[PDB]
Amino acid sequence: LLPAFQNAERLLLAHMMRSRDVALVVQERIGGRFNIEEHRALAAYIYAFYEEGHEADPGALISRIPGELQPLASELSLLLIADDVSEQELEDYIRHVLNRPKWLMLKVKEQEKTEAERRKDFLTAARIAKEMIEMKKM
């Protein structure tokens, strides 16, 4: 039951497990800036392989990288794609990950927004809608 974006963040930890000049631009693009709590250190072990220069492959990399990060990165290699990648699939995951945070920006402040509900405020509590609805319009 994996949602929409969780796989667009994976549109990296497999597109750079198999192609690293399709990973140098991530340094430029997704620093990051990453979403998930254990998916930041994974990137931190990706770019550091680009310097020493050895045999780069799907499974040669995922052992650097001791334990836990293998019934995870190996399950990041039980996938169903290929190495024919577009310019507008490279301009796609630009929003995806780094902006899933902005989907969050209609949750933690709603706790406040919905707490103006409990005080029967609809004068000004019926404005944050514009600082929400017409905030997602970018």
Binding site: A4, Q6, A8, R10, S86
Partner: peptide, 11 residues
């Protein structure tokens, strides 16, 4: 909702 939220790139 499980298929609207399923595709991580529509290309």
């Amino acid at each position: 909702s499980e298929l609207a939220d399923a595709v991580p790139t529509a290309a």
